[PDB]
């Protein structure tokens, strides 16, 4: 099956999911000297003040927290975005070292880790249908680095020792994804594509300008997770981040400066 090694990262997933070589492939470097500052996007939206987290599930290849998405509970809006998306998951990309482990560049600088908010447009009814329209999913993007530790993040750091295995899932009620976000929401935002299999071209990414500070501690712990499952050989979970892919024909528009 895919996955971020050698015989089956990143520069295989072509041959079973040719979109890979598509024109609107994620992530991207972003180039923040060609963005374009665009007055008529709006500010974004996130309200997140009714979000029901459920559970978190290592699944092989990363780990995510899942919400109840059967109401309208926690959504995004506005921006560049038309109509309501609704938080389903969040889930992280992370480095073996902290130089490295973001999916998204800036100017072409890696950030320790990048942690992403998955919504689905209600125009399509729920996920899987969302997932196969163009405009299916909106996915917002906020970069790690490493410094002070996140105090919103300690309570998923501290129940990763219970999923260190693909497939282990804990329950993971009553977590506030507000505690991930940093203070600003100035994003720059481009249309893009799952950033793993199926590499569906899906998305409008919003990617915030500013990074939330995690310590050296949180990182390593995401580190401690494996990608085997139980009984099997241990594979250590890290780096499990596509580089950046063509920008083609597409413009990042920025929502400020
Ligand atoms: N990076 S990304 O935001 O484009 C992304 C992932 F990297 C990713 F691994 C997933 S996955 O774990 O589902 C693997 C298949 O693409 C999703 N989709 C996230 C998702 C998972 C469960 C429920 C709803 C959304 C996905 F959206
Ligand atoms: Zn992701």
């Given at each position: 099956?895919?996955?971020?090694?050698?015989?089956?990262?990143?520069?295989?997933?072509?041959?079973?999911?040719?979109?890979?070589?598509?024109?609107?492939?994620?992530?991207?470097?972003?180039?923040?000297?060609?963005?374009?500052?665009?007055?008529?996007?709006?500010?974004?939206?996130?309200?997140?003040d009714?979000?029901?987290?459920?559970?978190?599930?290592?699944?092989?290849?990363?780990?995510?927290?899942?919400?109840?998405?059967?109401?309208?509970?926690?959504?995004?809006?506005?921006?560049?975005?038309?109509?309501?998306?609704?938080?389903?998951?969040?889930?992280?990309?992370?480095?073996?070292?902290?130089?490295?482990?973001?999916?998204?560049?800036?100017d072409?600088?890696?950030?320790?880790?990048?942690?992403?908010?998955?919504?689905?447009?209600?125009?399509?009814?729920?996920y899987?249908?969302?997932?196969?329209?163009?405009?299916?999913?909106?996915?917002?993007?906020?970069?790690?680095?490493?410094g002070?530790?996140?105090?919103?993040?300690?309570?998923?750091?501290?129940?990763?020792?219970?999923?260190?295995?693909?497939?282990?899932?804990?329950?993971?009620?009553?977590?506030?994804?507000?505690?991930?976000?940093?203070?600003?929401?100035?994003?720059?935002?481009?249309?893009?594509?799952?950033?793993?299999?199926?590499?569906?071209?899906?998305?409008?990414?919003?990617?915030?300008?500013?990074?939330?500070?995690?310590?050296?501690?949180?990182?390593?712990?995401?580190?401690?997770?494996?990608?085997?499952?139980?009984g099997?050989?241990?594979?250590?979970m890290?780096?499990?981040?596509?580089?950046?892919?063509?920008?083609?024909?597409?413009?990042?528009?920025?929502?400020?400066?």
């Open positions: 099956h895919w996955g971020y090694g050698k015989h089956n990262g990143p520069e295989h997933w072509h041959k079973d999911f040719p979109i890979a070589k598509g024109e609107r492939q994620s992530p991207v470097d972003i180039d923040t000297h060609t963005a374009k500052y665009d007055p008529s996007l709006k500010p974004l939206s996130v309200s997140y009714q979000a029901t987290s459920l559970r978190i599930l290592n699944t092989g290849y990363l780990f995510q927290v899942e919400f109840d998405d059967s109401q309208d509970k926690a959504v995004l809006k506005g921006g560049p975005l038309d109509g309501t998306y609704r938080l389903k998951q969040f889930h992280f990309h992370w480095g073996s070292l902290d130089g490295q482990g973001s999916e998204h560049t800036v072409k600088k890696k950030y320790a880790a990048e942690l992403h908010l998955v919504h689905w447009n209600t125009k399509y009814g729920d899987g249908k969302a997932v196969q329209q163009p405009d299916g999913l909106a996915v917002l993007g906020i970069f790690l680095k490493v002070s530790a996140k105090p919103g993040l300690q309570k998923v750091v501290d129940v990763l020792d219970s999923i260190k295995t693909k497939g282990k899932s804990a329950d993971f009620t009553n977590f506030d994804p507000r505690g991930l976000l940093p203070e600003s929401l100035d994003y720059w935002t481009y249309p893009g594509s799952l950033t793993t299999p199926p590499l569906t071209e899906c998305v409008t990414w919003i990617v915030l300008k500013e990074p939330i500070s995690v310590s050296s501690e949180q990182v390593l712990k995401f580190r401690k997770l494996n990608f085997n499952g139980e099997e050989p241990e594979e250590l890290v780096d499990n981040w596509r580089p950046a892919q063509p920008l083609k024909n597409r413009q990042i528009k920025a929502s400020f400066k």
